[PDB]
Design a binder for this molecule. Structure first.
Ligand SMILES: *[C@@H]1O[C@H](CO)[C@@H](O[C@@H]2O[C@H](CO)[C@@H](O[C@@H]3O[C@H](CO[C@H]4O[C@H](CO[C@H]5O[C@H](CO)[C@@H](O)[C@H](O)[C@@H]5O[C@H]5O[C@H](CO)[C@@H](O)[C@H](O)[C@@H]5O)[C@@H](O)[C@H](O[C@H]5O[C@H](CO)[C@@H](O)[C@H](O)[C@@H]5O)[C@@H]4O)[C@@H](O)[C@H](O[C@H]4O[C@H](CO)[C@@H](O)[C@H](O)[C@@H]4O[C@H]4O[C@H](CO)[C@@H](O)[C@H](O)[C@@H]4O[C@H]4O[C@H](CO)[C@@H](O)[C@H](O)[C@@H]4O)[C@@H]3O)[C@H](O)[C@H]2NC(C)=O)[C@H](O)[C@H]1NC(C)=O
Ligand SMILES: *[C@@H]1O[C@H](CO)[C@@H](O[C@@H]2O[C@H](CO)[C@@H](O[C@@H]3O[C@H](CO)[C@@H](O)[C@H](O[C@H]4O[C@H](CO)[C@@H](O)[C@H](O)[C@@H]4O[C@H]4O[C@H](CO)[C@@H](O)[C@H](O)[C@@H]4O)[C@@H]3O)[C@H](O)[C@H]2NC(C)=O)[C@H](O)[C@H]1NC(C)=O
Ligand SMILES: *[C@@H]1O[C@H](CO)[C@@H](O[C@@H]2O[C@H](CO)[C@@H](O)[C@H](O)[C@H]2NC(C)=O)[C@H](O)[C@H]1NC(C)=O
Lengths: 118, 104, 52, 126, 52, 110
């Protein structure tokens, strides 16, 4: 399920479908378990929503035309794929995520205005 | 809005003020039964109190469960009352009068 | 009272089941007049009911 | 001017009872409280009780609860103080004084603003 | 499943799972007593022997 | 009995200023706005000069003034004439249904 943790970005770029699969299950007892069973679908729907706004409904490694403002990392590829791992990298880029997302939304939408004109 | 769920029967306590002026609102003003709602532009500061100094007594009713009731009274008994400033009230009442005369 | 007009409390006493056992004892309390209604089927004013 | 008149003097044995009077004039006698205060010779003042003229419901310090009876007679504007079980300690001068106004919406009963006294009556327990 | 190249922090005394477990077992305890007999008439006077 | 402790006596001479005080408790003096002062001298019933902390009755003695802070109430004199020779008493509403007095004190003049 999560054996790819601690590995490099190149390593866990493969077997992402292993993590993508296992996010739904449950059955019923009353007060809490039902509350524990609408959390799964709600979490999955939110994570799919944010991926679908950015034109990335295909659950691949989705690639984007929004520039990497160097202030976000000020770091180079050579120090990243060879050694660095996902959680450790996430602790860095986490300082800018909410700013990044809206740019993805709008860029998807200008790509949309470009596609429609016929 | 932040709704204030306070309860009252003849005067709307602690409510939010009117929009810009005293406004009257009703389902059908011509009908008697439709209870009209009058919304005021300025508040009238009411104050109420009970001068008596009650004290509470612990009576026991069966196993484990208590029941409270008023014991003696320590002060000298007086009348519980409410107070409203007259000059505010009469002026506000006349303003409601003109807003009623708009429709009558 | 001889004179004046104020609220008054109508001191009342009742035979409640006591804190322990199904033993009984007497107890007293005060009740505002709207909470109390005269009972008596005969013309007597020494016996009262709660409005419940 | 407003003034209160009092009994002359009393002499009693221990275990007996004493009644002292306090008649007032010059103001509407029902509109003010009456405060009773005791003065032992060459010693501190001891406040004793108060009474509302229009009703009963006296109250007094715990030294004298269940032992002092209090009434007023509306006919002749006279208040009366009853001490029922005397001790040798109770030898002192007894005063009556007019208290705060009897408001119908505010509790002025406990207010120390009394401003008109009697002559003081000397009670001797011997 | 074992993770090969990871490291984490743990805290016994700030752990949340205990603060849920207590509520769980208190609630499950309370279910078992709801349909059962309530006693209450047993509070009556008890006269007992002088066993010696 | 009374919590209104008071000094025993003072003394002075013409033109001086003297401040009497009484210490009560948080229950009575430190909770209510109803301290008052009284005086008496032999052969006479006592007399009022300060009521409700600092206000004056009819006529007598604008000279006297008083105030309270914490559990302490005070009466202030200045000029200190011969008529001020009297036994001054501390008084306060004691909470509940009771007023309570202090021990009293003599102003030795002049
Ligand atoms: C909600 O709203 C309610 C209202 O609807 C409200 O209830 C009201 O609250 C107020 C505020 O708390 C209460 O006000 C009190 O009123 C008391 C009574 O006041 C009236 O009566 C007296 C006496 O009147 C007689 O004597 C005068 C002469 O003095 C005559 O001219 C009169 O005609 C009258 O005559 C008698 O004989 C007639 C014969 O037929 C009778 O018909 C008649 O009934 C009488 O028996 C008047 O003096 C009062 O006037 C005062 O006010 C005017 C206007 O400001 C002044 O110009 C005037 O000089 C007076 O000051 C009024 O007419 C008051 O006693 C009380 O004030 C005193 O007590 C309080 C409490 O202790 C003190 O804080 C205050 O400082 C006052 O103390 C002085 O007086 C008392 C005794 O009166 C003394 O014990 C005290 O030591 C001090 O006197 C000494 O010092 C004086 C110098 O400072 C000196 O002058 C004195 O001589 C003495 O040395 C207070 O004002 C009101 O009663 C409530 N309403 C009712 C119905 O009770 C309620 O609070 C509200 N609630 C809320 C939550 O908001
Ligand atoms: C409304 O009613 C309520 C009751 O329902 C009233 O509340 C009561 O108020 C009284 C005050 O009048 C208060 O009495 C005190 O109780 C304490 C016990 O809890 C006592 O310790 C205290 O005694 C000390 O103070 C007295 C003077 O106030 C002295 O006479 C006595 O000797 C004690 O003094 C010694 O101790 C103190 C403290 O250590 C020290 O500073 C002194 O120097 C001295 O050494 C009082 O008896 C009740 O406790 C109150 N009850 C409740 C339940 O709160 C209320 O006042 C009423 N209000 C109105 C407006 O009427
Ligand atoms: C209410 O009435 C009851 C009696 O019905 C009073 O209770 C008595 O009080 C006196 C005075 O302390 C005692 O001698 C009796 O022992 C009490 N009797 C009982 C049965 O408790 C009570 O004091 C009254 N209270 C008020 C506020 O009026």
């Amino acid at each position: 399920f999560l054996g790819a943790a601690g590995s490099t970005m190149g390593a866990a770029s493969m077997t992402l479908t292993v993590q993508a699969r296992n996010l739904l299950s449950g059955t019923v007892w009353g007060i809490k378990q039902l509350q524990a069973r609408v959390l799964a679908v709600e979490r999955y729907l939110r994570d799919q929503q944010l991926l679908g706004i950015w034109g990335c409904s295909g659950k691949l490694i989705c690639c984007t035309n929004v520039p990497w403002n160097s202030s976000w990392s000020n770091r180079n590829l050579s120090e990243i794929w060879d050694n660095m791992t996902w959680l450790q990298w996430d602790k860095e880029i986490s300082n800018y995520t909410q700013i990044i997302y809206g740019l993805l939304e709008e860029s998807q939408n200008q790509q949309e205005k470009n596609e429609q004109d016929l | 809005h932040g709704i204030r769920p306070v309860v009252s029967t003849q005067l709307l306590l602690n409510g939010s003020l009117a929009e810009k002026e005293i406004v009257i609102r009703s389902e059908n003003l011509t009908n008697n039964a439709k209870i009209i709602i009058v919304h005021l532009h300025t508040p009238v500061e009411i104050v109420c109190t009970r001068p008596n100094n009650n004290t509470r007594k612990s009576v026991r009713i069966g196993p484990g469960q208590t029941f409270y009731a008023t014991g003696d009274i320590i002060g000298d008994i007086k009348q519980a009352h409410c107070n409203i400033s007259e000059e505010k009230w009469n002026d506000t009442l006349q303003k409601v009068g003109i807003e009623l005369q708009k429709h009558f | 009272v001889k004179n004046g007009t104020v609220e008054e409390m109508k001191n009342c006493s009742f035979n409640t089941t006591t804190e322990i056992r199904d033993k009984e004892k007497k107890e007293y309390a005060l009740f505002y007049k709207p909470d109390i209604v005269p009972l008596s089927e005969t013309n007597n004013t020494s016996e009262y009911r709660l409005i419940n | 001017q407003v003034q209160l008149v009092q009994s002359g003097a009393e002499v009693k044995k221990p275990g007996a009872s004493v009644k002292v009077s306090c008649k007032a004039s010059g103001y509407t006698f029902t509109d003010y409280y009456i405060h009773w205060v005791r003065q032992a010779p060459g010693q501190g003042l001891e406040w004793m009780a108060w009474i509302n003229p229009t009703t009963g419901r006296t109250n007094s310090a715990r030294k004298f609860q269940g032992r002092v009876t209090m009434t007023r007679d509306t006919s002749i504007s006279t208040a009366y103080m009853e001490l029922r079980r005397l001790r040798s300690d109770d030898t002192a001068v007894y005063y009556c004084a007019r208290g705060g106004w009897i408001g119908l919406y505010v509790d002025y009963s406990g207010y120390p603003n009394f401003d008109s006294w009697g002559q003081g009556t000397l009670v001797t327990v011997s | 499943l074992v993770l090969g190249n990871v490291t984490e922090n743990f805290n016994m005394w700030k752990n949340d799972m205990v603060d849920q477990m207590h509520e769980d077992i208190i609630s499950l305890w309370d279910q078992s007593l709801k349909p059962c007999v309530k006693l209450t008439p047993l509070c009556v006077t008890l006269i007992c022997s002088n066993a010696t | 009995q009374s919590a209104l402790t008071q000094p025993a006596s003072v003394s002075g001479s013409p033109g001086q200023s003297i401040t009497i005080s009484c210490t009560g408790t948080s229950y009575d003096v430190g909770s209510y706005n109803l301290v008052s002062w009284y005086q008496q001298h032999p052969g006479k019933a006592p007399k009022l000069m300060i009521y409700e902390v600092s206000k004056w009755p009819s006529g007598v003695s604008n000279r006297f003034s008083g105030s309270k802070s914490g559990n302490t109430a005070s009466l202030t004199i200045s000029g200190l004439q011969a008529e001020d020779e009297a036994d001054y008493y501390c008084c306060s509403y004691a909470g509940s249904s009771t007023v309570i007095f202090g021990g009293g004190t003599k102003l030795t003049v002049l």
